Amino acid sequence: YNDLRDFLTLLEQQGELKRITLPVDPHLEITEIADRTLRAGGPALLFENPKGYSMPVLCNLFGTPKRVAMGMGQEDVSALREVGKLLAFLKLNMPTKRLRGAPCQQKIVSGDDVDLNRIPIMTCWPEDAAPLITWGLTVTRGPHKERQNLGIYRQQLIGKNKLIMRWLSHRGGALDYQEWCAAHPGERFPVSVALGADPATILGAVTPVPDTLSEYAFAGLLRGTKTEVVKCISNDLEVPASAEIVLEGYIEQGETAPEGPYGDHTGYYNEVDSFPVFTVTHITQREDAIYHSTYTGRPPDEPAVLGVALNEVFVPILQKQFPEIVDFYLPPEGCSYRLAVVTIKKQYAGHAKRVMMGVWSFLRQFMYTKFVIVCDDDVNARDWNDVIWAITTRMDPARDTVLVENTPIDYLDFASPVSGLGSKMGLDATNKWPGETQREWGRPIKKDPDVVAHIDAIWDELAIF
Amino acid sequence: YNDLRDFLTLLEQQGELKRITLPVDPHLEITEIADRTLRAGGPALLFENPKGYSMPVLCNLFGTPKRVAMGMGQEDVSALREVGKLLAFLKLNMPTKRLRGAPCQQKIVSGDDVDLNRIPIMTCWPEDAAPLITWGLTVTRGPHKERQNLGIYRQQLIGKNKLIMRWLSHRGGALDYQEWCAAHPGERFPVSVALGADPATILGAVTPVPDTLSEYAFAGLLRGTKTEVVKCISNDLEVPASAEIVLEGYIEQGETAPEGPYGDHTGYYNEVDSFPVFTVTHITQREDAIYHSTYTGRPPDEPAVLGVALNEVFVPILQKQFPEIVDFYLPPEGCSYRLAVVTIKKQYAGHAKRVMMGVWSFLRQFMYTKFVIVCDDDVNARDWNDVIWAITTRMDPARDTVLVENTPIDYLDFASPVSGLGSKMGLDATNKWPGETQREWGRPIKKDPDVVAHIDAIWDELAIF
Ligand SMILES: Cc1cc2c3c(c1C)C(C)(C)CC=[N+]3c1c([nH]c(=O)[nH]c1=O)N2C[C@H](O)[C@H](O)[C@H](O)COP(=O)(O)O
Ligand SMILES: Cc1cc2c3c(c1C)C(C)(C)CC=[N+]3c1c([nH]c(=O)[nH]c1=O)N2C[C@H](O)[C@H](O)[C@H](O)COP(=O)(O)O
Ligand SMILES: [Mn+2]
Numbered sequence: 001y002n003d004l005r006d007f008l009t010l011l012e013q014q015g016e017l018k019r020i021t022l023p024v025d026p027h028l029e030i031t032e033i034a035d036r037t038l039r040a041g042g043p044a045l046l047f048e049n050p051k052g053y054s055m056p057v058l059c060n061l062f063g064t065p066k067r068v069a070m071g072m073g074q075e076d077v078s079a080l081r082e083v084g085k086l087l088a089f090l091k092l093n094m095p096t097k098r099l100r101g102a103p104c105q106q107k108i109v110s111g112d113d114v115d116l117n118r119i120p121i122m123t124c125w126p127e128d129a130a131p132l133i134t135w136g137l138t139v140t141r142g143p144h145k146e147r148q149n150l151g152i153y154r155q156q157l158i159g160k161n162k163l164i165m166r167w168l169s170h171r172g173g174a175l176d177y178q179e180w181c182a183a184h185p186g187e188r189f190p191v192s193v194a195l196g197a198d199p200a201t202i203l204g205a206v207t208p209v210p211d212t213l214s215e216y217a218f219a220g221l222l223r224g225t226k227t228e229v230v231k232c233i234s235n236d237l238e239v240p241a242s243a244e245i246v247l248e249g250y251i252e253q254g255e256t257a258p259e260g261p262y263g264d265h266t267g268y269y270n271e272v273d274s275f276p277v278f279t280v281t282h283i284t285q286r287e288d289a290i291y292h293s294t295y296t297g298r299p300p301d302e303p304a305v306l307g308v309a310l311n312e313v314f315v316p317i318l319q320k321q322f323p324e325i326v327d328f329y330l331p332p333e334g335c336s337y338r339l340a341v342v343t344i345k346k347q348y349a350g351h352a353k354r355v356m357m358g359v360w361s362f363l364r365q366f367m368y369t370k371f372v373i374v375c376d377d378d379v380n381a382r383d384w385n386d387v388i389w390a391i392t393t394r395m396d397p398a399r400d401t402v403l404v405e406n407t408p409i410d411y412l413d414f415a416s417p418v419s420g421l422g423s424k425m426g427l428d429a430t431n432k433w434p435g436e437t438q439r440e441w442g443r444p445i446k447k448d449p450d451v452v453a454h455i456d457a458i459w460d461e462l463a464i465f
Numbered sequence: 466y467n468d469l470r471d472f473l474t475l476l477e478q479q480g481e482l483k484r485i486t487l488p489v490d491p492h493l494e495i496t497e498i499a500d501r502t503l504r505a506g507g508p509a510l511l512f513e514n515p516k517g518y519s520m521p522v523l524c525n526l527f528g529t530p531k532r533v534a535m536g537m538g539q540e541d542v543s544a545l546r547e548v549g550k551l552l553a554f555l556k557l558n559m560p561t562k563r564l565r566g567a568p569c570q571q572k573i574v575s576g577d578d579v580d581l582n583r584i585p586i587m588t589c590w591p592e593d594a595a596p597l598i599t600w601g602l603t604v605t606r607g608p609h610k611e612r613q614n615l616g617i618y619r620q621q622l623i624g625k626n627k628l629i630m631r632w633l634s635h636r637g638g639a640l641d642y643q644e645w646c647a648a649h650p651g652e653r654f655p656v657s658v659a660l661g662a663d664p665a666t667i668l669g670a671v672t673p674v675p676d677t678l679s680e681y682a683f684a685g686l687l688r689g690t691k692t693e694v695v696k697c698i699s700n701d702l703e704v705p706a707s708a709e710i711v712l713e714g715y716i717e718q719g720e721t722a723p724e725g726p727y728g729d730h731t732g733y734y735n736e737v738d739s740f741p742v743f744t745v746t747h748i749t750q751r752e753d754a755i756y757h758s759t760y761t762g763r764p765p766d767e768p769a770v771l772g773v774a775l776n777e778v779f780v781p782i783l784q785k786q787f788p789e790i791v792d793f794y795l796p797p798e799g800c801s802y803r804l805a806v807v808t809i810k811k812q813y814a815g816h817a818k819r820v821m822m823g824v825w826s827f828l829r830q831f832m833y834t835k836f837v838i839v840c841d842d843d844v845n846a847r848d849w850n851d852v853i854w855a856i857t858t859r860m861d862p863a864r865d866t867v868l869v870e871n872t873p874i875d876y877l878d879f880a881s882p883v884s885g886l887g888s889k890m891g892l893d894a895t896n897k898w899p900g901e902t903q904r905e906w907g908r909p910i911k912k913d914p915d916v917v918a919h920i921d922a923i924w925d926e927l928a929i930f
């Protein structure tokens with residue numbers, strides 16, 4: 001049973017983990033180092049000597065797509081499509097195996113002894129309001145079913161034992177809380193947060209499984225074995241037995257705090273807003289605990305890289321519905337969800353428009369995607385040289401652009417005319433068939449596949465780089 | 466095992482079948498009578514004395530939605546949603562049970578003895594080219610899989626032993642033929658057509674199951690028992706053992722004939738066009754054979770009524786994908802597929818636009834639907850009094866209308882600017898939320914559910930009608 005430490009050893013053996021012994025400040029400096037590292041596609045980083053703390057800080061864990069694949073037990077990034085077919089089928093799944101004891105409860109501190117200032121919580125960007133917890137798996141139950149939701153919600157430090165719980169309203173945690181308030185007026189909402197669980201559990205948290213299903217069950221499928229958990233000390237929620245640190249407590253109904261500003265995955269600061277306060281009554285941890293953290297900012301960042309790997313999971317699901325789709329890609333540069341490029345085997349005049357409408361309606365992850373570019377299958381969706389070529393040689397802008405107004409848009413997207421509402425643009429860059437054009441369309445240059453294959457074979461021997 | 470005769474007895478016992486003993490001409494007159502009957506919601510009709518023939522003609526079999534439900538073994542039309550959930554799951558299924566002999570091969574005629582003029586084939590409308598077979602289950606195999614497709618394709622009489630096979634190019638039969646031609650150049654394509662099978666087999670033929678699956682297998686699920694078949698005499702295709710009449714033969718590669726004009730479900734004539742010729746080498750039938758027929762024309766007609774019952778099947782499938790959908794209805798007046806009304810529990814600004822795009826992209830049956838009206842759940846989608854009310858009180862036409870151009874359109878829709886290509890219109894008639902409008906929206910009048918329930922209870926006793 002691989003916990004997180006086993007994963008770090010695996011990475012270190014493969015030159016995918018680097019230990020920093022120099023003094024480095026959790027205030028701003030770690031983010032700067034990790035940002036350079038990620039942008040050059042370097043290793044995961046373990047800062048063994050954070051200025052002013054004894055607990056090492058692990059970050060950039062999932063800063064390459066390879067390391068996301070490795071964290072699901074697979075060799076490479078193409079294996080992620082198979083986990084996508086699996087995800088199709090859930091739309092008996094395996095419960096958790098509850099241990100009687102666990103390393104994450106070796107050292108326990110509670111009540112007045114709780115001090116989150118002892119943890120090397122990072123400050124990411126210069127005008128961020130305060131230190132911010134960024135890799136917490138938040139565990140909740142609602143009042144109406146047994147299912148335990150795991151989510152990643154950022155958490156601002158506001159006291160020795162107070163965090164802000166910044167879940168957006170469509171998240172599992174926020175729905176569970178909202179229902180608890182209606183169904184049990186005035187009663188404290190139990191909550192627990194696990195830091196540094198095994199990678200299958202972490203990636204399971206972030207994969208959008210149904211709300212009906214526990215993210216613990218999915219992680220079991222990725223792992224091949226049941227997720228090992230332990231009952232929390234102060235509530236009936238279960239947390240991963242291998243966790244490095246666990247926070248337990250509750251949300252007092254009505255209690256809220258102004259959150260942020262914080263730099264966001266779009267590369268801008270979110271302005272201040274109110275969210276629930278999470279009161280921390282217990283902090284449990286391993287001997288030798290490692291603090292797992294990250295940051296978001298201008299893309300690409302670790303979330304963006306996670307998001308590119310998880311898009312591979314969705315390709316199969318889309319292809320099941322739309323078998324004409326050859327590839328489907330959401331570039332990191334587009335803030336991970338705002339632009340999609342789709343390639344198809346076009347079969348009839350107008351086909352591109354059906355595909356756009358499918359991207360905008362089929363799955364909710366893409367409901368808010370404001371640019372969609374559709375191309376033929378001779379275009380590599382992942383290369384702007386091909387995509388721009390297609391746009392500039394197969395479109396007449398006014399004929400081939402679809403605009404739709406008053407559509408749902410992310411409420412934090414300041415570029416839309418009104419919060420929550422905006423337009424979308426679809427670019428039909430497919431070759432135009434009779435009916436779509438009265439001109440003689442051009443015959444595109446295709447490569448000889450035998451020449452390509454021969455050059456693949458002798459490429460290393462050629463030794464050009 | 467209910468064959469068709471058992472179904473007719475069931476109908477007759479319930480006042481849903483009427484026998485006509487007066488002389489009535491298959492040329493034009495039967496259509497006129499059936500049209501009046503259907504438009505007044507009357508029974509199925511068995512003309513025992515067709516002028517100039519000895520074989521009775523059965524028509525308007527499925528001219529009420531009730532009779533469609535009855536033909537699936539169910540009591541009423543609401544049960545069709547359950548067959549819809551079933552249809553969701555197929556996306557072991559049961560093979561056919563092959564009998565050693567069958568009533569449909571009691572009287573056999575072949576080669577030079579084949580005369581389709583002995584059958585009371587109907588002429589539907591005054592300017593139709595020729596008599597037309599309208600309720601044939603066409604059975605085919607492709608060369609690449611075992612699966613037997615059943616489809617209903619209209620067939621013009623052009624000789625003693627020649628029919629035109631008018632399958633549109635996306636039908637199972639037409640794809641099977643097309644592949645046969647590529648895979649076995651110049652070889653005759655075996656084909657067989659069953660007239661008057663049991664109602665589960667007929668409705669199975671017309672339900673859009675996957676191309677992967679045999680329509681015979683679905684009929685088995687509707688029935689509860691395997692579809693009983695018999696091997697054809699002249700090929701390896703299987704036809705329903707209970708069939709009243711079966712035509713066997715082949716399509717000679719390259720041989721085509723000008724088809725029509727024929728009046729169509731839109732209420733207009735299709736102009737002439739070429740289709741493959743089906744050469745009939747055998748005609749098998751029961752003692753006492755009954756000829757099953759119908760017509761299409763200005764809606765509503767039997768196809769339209771079939772189509773309304775089968776839309777009930779799709780509601781669940783749509784709801785699985787889009788749980789906000791409360792109801793989804795394609796009125797017969799809109800030529801059965803050209804306009805849809807959808808009602809939703811609206812949950813956010815812009816929601817109607819996601820739903821429109823789903824209707825236009827999720828299922829292929831609705832890819833060609835050119836008007837979509839979206840309303841809230843206080844509107845009965847099936848009552849133009851509600852729908853027009855919603856349109857006229859909740860829309861500003863220019864703000865709330867979505868137009869999209871150069872989308873796929875049915876090639877026979879003469880109203881589009883170019884064959885196969887046209888625009889679509891979505892009307893967002895939902896209540897507008899903040900963001901969508903800066904005005905104070907109106908509070909709609911809701912009825913007291915206790916008053917409604919009380920009036921349901923005393924309604925018969927009130928005896929107003
Ligand atoms: C990986 C990751 C995902 C974050 C995230 C972060 C990371 C590292 C941070 C901490 C660096 C900064 C932004 N975080 C938030 C977030 N979702 C959210 O509602 N609030 C957030 O603050 N997301 C997304 C959220 O965790 C995922 O969408 C989950 O799949 C939601 O699960 P649920 O649908 O069960 O609630
Ligand atoms: C019930 C019914 C369906 C007709 C039909 C008729 C009826 C009575 C007629 C005979 C009265 C006049 C129009 N017919 C045609 C037709 N489809 C087609 O390609 N050509 C047709 O001529 N349809 C539709 C076709 O039979 C159904 O769409 C099948 O589900 C197609 O099956 P497939 O997808 O397996 O080919
Ligand atoms: Mn979840």
Ligand SMILES: [Mn+2]
Nearest residue numbers: 614615637676
């Ligand atoms: Mn079929």
Ligand code: NA
Nearest residue numbers: 150151205206
């Ligand atoms: Na989650």
Ligand code: NA
Nearest residue numbers: 615616670671
């Ligand atoms: Na069919």
